[PDB]
Structures are given as structure tokens and as C-alpha cells.
């Protein structure tokens, strides 16, 4: 049917940059028919928020750096000077049809200067060890860019396949990421080895950083 094709699917820009997102109605629609295009912003973990309605009206309370415009069946949302807090996925919505449809969304990412991670390592707790499993956690806090390599070593054996990483979404104040890597071992294996080391490589570190502990110290 009638749909909105939103582009680009993602973009990045620096704070202070002007950014433009476009929605085009998938077909030629008569000009007698109104679309009442809305735009919504969705931050991580949160419901969408209304930014612009009826093509170009700024919703109450929305910063004036947001604006909408429409011409024919092409619609744009413009952020005149990107702020860190504008990290989000933005969606257009058309009401030519009932039901109305949403565009596919545009992820806006923030470019900023390189920031090295602070790194921390956490032994398994004694409480967890009682249950039969040992989780070792390495934390990389507030870094940019997202790319990072974390390597686990147990008495100098490279661990492979037995860790999982999780990365936060870019922070709405400083535009950094954080990352956890969790190494899972059986209690019996945790207890056969001594040295636990997390080695971290990232563009902001001139060489790799290791954090380690010795079991039982």
C-alpha cells in the first residue's frame, strides 16, 4: 500500500552539526489527500516522544532546533544543531491511510573525540561459587569509539568461546559507550587456576591495558 520510505537508516554527526532526515510517500498520492506527517524521537529503553505534527508544527515543549517541513510527498525533519542528548532513533508517521504507518526509522549517532576506557575486573563472588559457577567480569567504562577488543587469559591460556559482551547505547551526556565482558567458568576450573587477566585494546590507549587478579588474594 501507501508507505513511507525513510532515509538514511543511520547517520552520524558532530555536536553543532545540522542533520536532516527524509521520509517519502512510497507512491504518487493525489494532492487533495492530506498526510498529516508526524515525527517521533525514541531514546533507548523509552517510549517514543512526539516532536513534530501535521508536517511542520513543533509540539509543545520540544526544543526549537527541531523542525519539520513537507513538499509534495517528501518530508523532512531537521535538527539545526545536534546536541548529545539527541542520540536516538527517529520515526516519521503518515496518516494518508487508516491505519497510519511509520517509517522504518533513522538512527542518529554522535561523533566525538577519542576517549580511552577505564578498565576494571571483578572476581566471582563467594556466594556464586557456592552454586557451582564462576563469572569473571571485565568492565570498560566511558570510551569512544565503540570498537574495542577484550581478551581473557587464565594462567596465560587465551579463553575463546566462553565469554559474552554487552555494550551500552551511546550516553546522552558525553556520547561514550561502556562494555562488559563476562567469562563463565565451572567452579572446579576456576579453582584450578590462579591468574585471571582481562586485556583491553582500544584506539585511545597507546598500548593494551591488562587488569588481573590472583584467585584468593
Amino acid at each position: 500500500d501507501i508507505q513511507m520510505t525513510q532515509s538514511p537508516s543511520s547517520l552520524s554527526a558532530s555536536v553543532g552539526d545540522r542533520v536532516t532526515i527524509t521520509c517519502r510517500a512510497s507512491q504518487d498520492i493525489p494532492r487533495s489527500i492530506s498526510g498529516y506527517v508526524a515525527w517521533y524521537q525514541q531514546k533507548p529503553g523509552k517510549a517514543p516522544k512526539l516532536l513534530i505534527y501535521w508536517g511542520s508544527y513543533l509540539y509543545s515543549g520540544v526544543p526549537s532546533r527541531f523542525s519539520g517541513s513537507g513538499s509534495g510527498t517528501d518530508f523532512t525533519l531537521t535538527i539545526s544543531s545536534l546536541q548529545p542528548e539527541d542520540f536516538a532513533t527517529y520515526y516519521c508517521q503518515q496518516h494518508y491511510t487508516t491505519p497510519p504507518t511509520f517509517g522504518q526509522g533513522t538512527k542518529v549517532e554522535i561523533k566525538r573525540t577519542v576517549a580511552a576506557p577505564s578498565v576494571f575486573i571483578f572476581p566471582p563472588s563467594d556466594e556464586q561459587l557456592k552454586s557451582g559457577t564462576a563469572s569473571v567480569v571485565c568492565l570498560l567504562n566511558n570510551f569512544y569509539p565503540r570498537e574495542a577488543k577484550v581478551q581473557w587469559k587464565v594462567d596465560n591460556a587465551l579463553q575463546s568461546g566462553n565469554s559474552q559482551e554487552s555494550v551500552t547505547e551511546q550516553d546522552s551526556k558525553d556520547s561514550t559507550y561502556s562494555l562488559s565482558s563476562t567469562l563463565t567458568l565451572s567452579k572446579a576450573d576456576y579453582e584450578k587456576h590462579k591468574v585471571y587477566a582481562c586485556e583491553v585494546t582500544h584506539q585511545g590507549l597507546s598500548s593494551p591495558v591488562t587488569k588481573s587478579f590472583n584467585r584468593g588474594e
Binding site: 505534527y53 520515526y91 504507518t101 526509522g105 577505564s118 576494571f120 556466594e127 554487552s166 561502556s178 563476562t182
Partner: protein, 220 residues
């Protein structure tokens, strides 16, 4: 004080049915229209249904037509979404929203959303373990809680019952090969505070009715 608050989400078997509720306050639904919109994990928004409560008029997306039913009960200022014959592709956060004023075609207030997970697997409540500050960077230490082996999503974590928000990172959950989820929440704090400031992670996993408050501190 305009608000919409969903409830009723959680786990349901494929084939099963679930009913969501959207409770409004600060306005009457009689005066407006109510909508449901959903979002599958990592995907975009999909419109689901709409109702004009005053006269019962309803419309539905094709994808749910014949299985979902939207309704409302104006004496309780509440709207509902009855979902039947659920399949994996119905797994999503479901939001309700409204139009306000006579501002049609603009969803101005939305609820917080509620996750519906369609799966054969059973519920399992998590264990909460400390990530004890050893560790330290400058005079900054990190600490946290590891929330391990739960199903389905979601878990929420807060620190010191909402009083501690700065420097908190709660990580997106990871799905382990066991089919259970696990997450950590960490916070950076001053090393000097460790002796005297209490840090407690408040963990809640509604699907298993598991609430835990765990004090995290320097070991031995």
C-alpha cells in the same frame, strides 16, 4: 499528570492469549482516542489498533486483524488489548498512547511499554551476586550487581532506591546458550566513599515475582 500506565505483559505460550491494560489518569479516555503500537526486539514501530471509546469504533492493522481486539471501559478510564493466538513474531514491547485535544494524528502521550514474550520456555527467577569494589581507577572505584540466569526479560535495576543515578550503567541483557538471560549493572563511585556510603542494587524481575535488594561492599 496526564499519564498512561500499561500492565499485563510477560510470558505466554505460542497459541496462548494475553490481555493488556492501559490505565489513564489526568484526562478521560471518553474525550479522546486510544492506540496500541508495538516494537519487536531491535525493530521499528508497528501500529496495532485504535479505538474511540465514546462509541466503540475500532480499527486494526492487517497483521493482527482477527486475533486482537481492542476495547475500552470508560467507567474505569482504562483500555485493553486482548491478544489471541500469539506467535513468536508477536514478541514485542506494546505501548499505548492517545491523541489529545482535537489534535488528531499525533500521539502526544505514550505509556512506558510492556514486554510480551511468546515462548514455550518456563519462567526462571534470577540470582543476584555482587561485583565488589576491590575495583579502583584513580580515586574512582567500580562496583555492581550481576543478575544471572532469568527468563523471560525484563529485569530492572536501580541503585539505592533511585537515589543513585550518576555513573550507573545497566547493560543490555545477554542470552546465554542455556536459553537464560543475564545482565550486570555497575556504578562508578569515589574510592573514599567506600568505607561509609552504602550501595544497594534493587533488582526486580516481575515475571518470577523476584525482588531483591543487595548490598555491595569491599570483600573481607
Amino acid at each position: 499528570e496526564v499519564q498512561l500506565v500499561e500492565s499485563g505483559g510477560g510470558l505466554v505460550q505460542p497459541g496462548g492469549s494475553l490481555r493488556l491494560s492501559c490505565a489513564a489518569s489526568g484526562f478521560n479516555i471518553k474525550d479522546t482516542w486510544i492506540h496500541w503500537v508495538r516494537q519487536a526486539p531491535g525493530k521499528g514501530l508497528e501500529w496495532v489498533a485504535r479505538i474511540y471509546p465514546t462509541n466503540g469504533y475500532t480499527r486494526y492493522a492487517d497483521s493482527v486483524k482477527g486475533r486482537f481486539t481492542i476495547s475500552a471501559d470508560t467507567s474505569k478510564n482504562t483500555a485493553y488489548l486482548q491478544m489471541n493466538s500469539l506467535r513468536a513474531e508477536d514478541t514485542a514491547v506494546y505501548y499505548c498512547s492517545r491523541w489529545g485535544g482535537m489534535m488528531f494524528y499525533a500521539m502526544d502521550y505514550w505509556g512506558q511499554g510492556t514486554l510480551v514474550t511468546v515462548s514455550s520456555a518456563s519462567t526462571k527467577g534470577p540470582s543476584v551476586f555482587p561485583l565488589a569494589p576491590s575495583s579502583t581507577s584513580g580515586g574512582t572505584a567500580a562496583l555492581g550487581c550481576l543478575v544471572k540466569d532469568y527468563f523471560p526479560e525484563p529485569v530492572t535495576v536501580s541503585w539505592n532506591s533511585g537515589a543513585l543515578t550518576s555513573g550507573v550503567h545497566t547493560f543490555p541483557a545477554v542470552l546465554q546458550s542455556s536459553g537464560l538471560y543475564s545482565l550486570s549493572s555497575v556504578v562508578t563511585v569515589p574510592s573514599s566513599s567506600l568505607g561509609t556510603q552504602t550501595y544497594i542494587c534493587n533488582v526486580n524481575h516481575k515475571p518470577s515475582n523476584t525482588k531483591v535488594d543487595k548490598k555491595v561492599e569491599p570483600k573481607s
